[PDB]
Amino acid sequence: PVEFPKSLRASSHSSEGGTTKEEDIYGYELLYRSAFASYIAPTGAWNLVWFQAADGSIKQARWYGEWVISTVLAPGKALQGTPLTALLWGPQDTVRLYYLSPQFELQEWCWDTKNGADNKYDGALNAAKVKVAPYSKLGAVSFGGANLRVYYQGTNNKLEEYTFGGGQGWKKGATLPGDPLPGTYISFVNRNKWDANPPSIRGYFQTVTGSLAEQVWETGGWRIGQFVIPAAPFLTPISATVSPEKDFPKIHVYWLSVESTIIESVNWHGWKAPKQIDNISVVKADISATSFTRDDGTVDVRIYGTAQLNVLFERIFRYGVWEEKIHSISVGKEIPIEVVGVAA
Amino acid sequence: PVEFPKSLRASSHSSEGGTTKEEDIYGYELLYRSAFASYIAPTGAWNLVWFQAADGSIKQARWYGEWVISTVLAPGKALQGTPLTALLWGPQDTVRLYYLSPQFELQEWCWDTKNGADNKYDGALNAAKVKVAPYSKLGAVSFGGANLRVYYQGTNNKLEEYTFGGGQGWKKGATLPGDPLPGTYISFVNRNKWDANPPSIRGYFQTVTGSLAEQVWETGGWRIGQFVIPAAPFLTPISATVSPEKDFPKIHVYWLSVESTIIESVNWHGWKAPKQIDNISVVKADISATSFTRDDGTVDVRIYGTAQLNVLFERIFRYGVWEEKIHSISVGKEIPIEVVGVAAAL
Numbered sequence: 001p002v003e004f005p006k007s008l009r010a011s012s013h014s015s016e017g018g019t020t021k022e023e024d025i026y027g028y029e030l031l032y033r034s035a036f037a038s039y040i041a042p043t044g045a046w047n048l049v050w051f052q053a054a055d056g057s058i059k060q061a062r063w064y065g066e067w068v069i070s071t072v073l074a075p076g077k078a079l080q081g082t083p084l085t086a087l088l089w090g091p092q093d094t095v096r097l098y099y100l101s102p103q104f105e106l107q108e109w110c111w112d113t114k115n116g117a118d119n120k121y122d123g124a125l126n127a128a129k130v131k132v133a134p135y136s137k138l139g140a141v142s143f144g145g146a147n148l149r150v151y152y153q154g155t156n157n158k159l160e161e162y163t164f165g166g167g168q169g170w171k172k173g174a175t176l177p178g179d180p181l182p183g184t185y186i187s188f189v190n191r192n193k194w195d196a197n198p199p200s201i202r203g204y205f206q207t208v209t210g211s212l213a214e215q216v217w218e219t220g221g222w223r224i225g226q227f228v229i230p231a232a233p234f235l236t237p238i239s240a241t242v243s244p245e246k247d248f249p250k251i252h253v254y255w256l257s258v259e260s261t262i263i264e265s266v267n268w269h270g271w272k273a274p275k276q277i278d279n280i281s282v283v284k285a286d287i288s289a290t291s292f293t294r295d296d297g298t299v300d301v302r303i304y305g306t307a308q309l310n311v312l313f314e315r316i317f318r319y320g321v322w323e324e325k326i327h328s329i330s331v332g333k334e335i336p337i338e339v340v341g342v343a344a
Numbered sequence: 345p346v347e348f349p350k351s352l353r354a355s356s357h358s359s360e361g362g363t364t365k366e367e368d369i370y371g372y373e374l375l376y377r378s379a380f381a382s383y384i385a386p387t388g389a390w391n392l393v394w395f396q397a398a399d400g401s402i403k404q405a406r407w408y409g410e411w412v413i414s415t416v417l418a419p420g421k422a423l424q425g426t427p428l429t430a431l432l433w434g435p436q437d438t439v440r441l442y443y444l445s446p447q448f449e450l451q452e453w454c455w456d457t458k459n460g461a462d463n464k465y466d467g468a469l470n471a472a473k474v475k476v477a478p479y480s481k482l483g484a485v486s487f488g489g490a491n492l493r494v495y496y497q498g499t500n501n502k503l504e505e506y507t508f509g510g511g512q513g514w515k516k517g518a519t520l521p522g523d524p525l526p527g528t529y530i531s532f533v534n535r536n537k538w539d540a541n542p543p544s545i546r547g548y549f550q551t552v553t554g555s556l557a558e559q560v561w562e563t564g565g566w567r568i569g570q571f572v573i574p575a576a577p578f579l580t581p582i583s584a585t586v587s588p589e590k591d592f593p594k595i596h597v598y599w600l601s602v603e604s605t606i607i608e609s610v611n612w613h614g615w616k617a618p619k620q621i622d623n624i625s626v627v628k629a630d631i632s633a634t635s636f637t638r639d640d641g642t643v644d645v646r647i648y649g650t651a652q653l654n655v656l657f658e659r660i661f662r663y664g665v666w667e668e669k670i671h672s673i674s675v676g677k678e679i680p681i682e683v684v685g686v687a688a689a690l
């Protein structure tokens with residue numbers, strides 16, 4: 001078998017006190033510790049998840065009644081270990097996926113379905129040849145329709161913005177405040193609706209001290225916000241999502257605990273205390289959260305990431321509860337392996 | 345600060361029972377979880393370590409009284425996250441480093457220094473265009489001088505061999521026995537001297553069951569050996585090294601425990617029970633062991649790898665003891681970060 005810390009739970013079928021003996025899955029055609037991006041339709045009708053296969057291609061898992069896997073970027077196009085982040089607007093007929101080339105330049109993939117078209121193509125951002133820190137992660141928001149903002153870590157470790165819209169093409173945007181940890185995970189959200197202008201932007205990142213911090217764009221420029229987590233694991237995955245609840249933006253910020261369990265902080269008329277959503281240890285690797293507002297007014301959340309041993313999980317918050325059923329989305333060949341909990 | 349499990353020690357200066365509050369170093373120009381290859385000279389005089397920088401270049405740390413860092417392969421030559429493995433013979437003037445291209449093909453870097461030469465150049469393996477499983481690790485041995493063997497994981501997850509020597513050029517070699525875990529770490533050693541022929545080859549890997557297993561080559565062919573570890577962490581780093589102690593090959597096999605401490609098992613007139621070499625948790629990432637035999641017949645070991653938070657460590661076994669001082673080798677810009685031991689999620 002493989003050994004796992006006895007005090008930690010490897011799956012939803014682990015013993016209550018930790019792992020004793022169980023079977024878990026290794027999906028070996030998923031890049032180990034793959035990046036993830038995601039977007040659920042604002043109606044909840046379908047879901048998009050993007051990930052990196054073992055061969056370095058970028059693939060898509062689309063849920064529409066069932067999950068269907070496809071390839072969106074051929075092998076050779078993306079850095080092995082690229083970050084990923086996605087945009088969806090129109091309300092839901094225009095998709096952009098951002099990633100890094102093997103030369104650490106911002107790249108863009110475009111998928112347009114307006115009027116029943118199906119165009120998939122390289123975006124104009126590639127022309128700017130924006131070289132980023134090689135360990136940079138990526139975030140992005142959209143507003144007013146096709147006004148786009150891409151966030152990354154520049155070569156001096158500051159967070160940086162690139163902008164698109166208003167007929168200007170891609171241009172360098174703001175340099176953001178704060179002192180970001182080199183290689184920090186980053187996640188940016190727009191608290192206002194996709195077609196509204198101005199946006200209300202928040203970004204989440206880890207600082208050089210290990211704390212988690214918040215970027216705010218609200219009225220007159222970028223500032224550091226009130227969200228402060230004094231201590232978090234080194235290079236902890238971070239992903240945030242926002243959707244309105246009772247006509248007010250509900251931000252969910254997720255990161256990993258020292259046990260690699262998922263911690264959630266909610267902003268909705270103030271920040272609520274961080275809370276562990278479940279006690280199952282995921283692989284310490286990128287996660288991706290998305291959300292929508294049901295027609296009954298409640299906010300659903302989905303989180304994607306890597307579960308033991310190497311599988312794409314889906315965690316579901318629906319009707320006010322995290323479902324005990326944690327799904328797994330197969331992306332290729334798999335082997336089952338026995339796992340035993342071992343003490344120090 | 346950053347949070348670290350309170351029950352684990354992050355460094356030599358951690359409290360006796362785990363981490364309380366301390367400062368540790370983030371070397372952010374070392375690729376996080378870099379691969380490592382290494383070779384100490386058979387005389388013990390100097391050391392070579394290879395690693396991947398954050399920008400994807402392959403760099404070299406050379407010790408000869410002091411550590412000196414140089415760049416051997418520019419960005420673009422190697423896959424981001426490439427495995428690495430090295431050969432040294434001549435007895436000690438001919439170096440090879442194996443890595444993967446960004447298209448998952450075997451590549452070879454050569455460094456020849458015989459007769460005072462100083463030549464770095466691409467090897468002929470590149471032209472063979474050998475596609476491997478994208479998560480393949482790499483091992484290699486040399487014998488009879490320049491008879492070379494490169495070990496990798498093929499697309500069907502079997503371990504595979506490529507051969508060089510006898511004027512034949514690079515050719516496909518054996519398919520090895522056993523059922524390897526996809527992406528397993530691998531480490532191959534030659535128990536016989538660099539100029540001897542035949543070799544006595546051992547390889548260490550993780551199987552589909554999670555156990556650790558051993559490849560054996562002797563005259564007659566390949567077989568699965570008697571070294572068996574029934575359970576190990578999933579995708580545990582593995583590195584082995586061999587050198588003669590009192591004229592008999594002493595194999596040291598290293599892997600990580602669930603606490604990410606280094607476990608050692610020695611073969612020398614039989615296998616000895618696995619034993620933790622120290623209780624400091626390294627980053628769960630590639631390690632690299634090397635060894636040499638002193639004039640008195642005793643065997644020194646060096647282990648390289650990633651220590652918290654992201655630093656290149658050197659652990660030293662010298663004159664029969666692991667030295668308490670665990671060294672760090674700076675490879676670029678660094679920031680110190682406070683680390684606090686935490687017992688629960690919140």
Ligand SMILES: OC[C@H]1O[C@@H](O)[C@@H](O)[C@@H](O)[C@@H]1O
Binds near residue numbers: 096123125
């Ligand atoms: O129509 C294609 C264009 O769409 C815009 O929204 C941006 O994504 C451009 O970079 C892209 O070239």
Ligand SMILES: OC[C@H]1O[C@@H](O)[C@@H](O)[C@@H](O)[C@@H]1O
Binds near residue numbers: 454466
């Ligand atoms: O002389 C150069 C040659 O050296 C041999 O040992 C091998 O490494 C070859 O691949 C290389 O081309």
Ligand SMILES: OC[C@H]1O[C@@H](O)[C@@H](O)[C@@H](O)[C@@H]1O
Binds near residue numbers: 558560568569
């Ligand atoms: O002769 C075969 C045996 O040789 C010894 O050196 C060890 O490596 C054993 O594990 C192996 O099975």
Ligand SMILES: OC[C@H]1O[C@H](O)[C@@H](O)[C@@H](O)[C@@H]1O
Binds near residue numbers: 214218267270
């Ligand atoms: O207006 C800025 C303010 O907006 C929201 O309330 C949250 O994102 C806060 O953390 C932030 O300080």
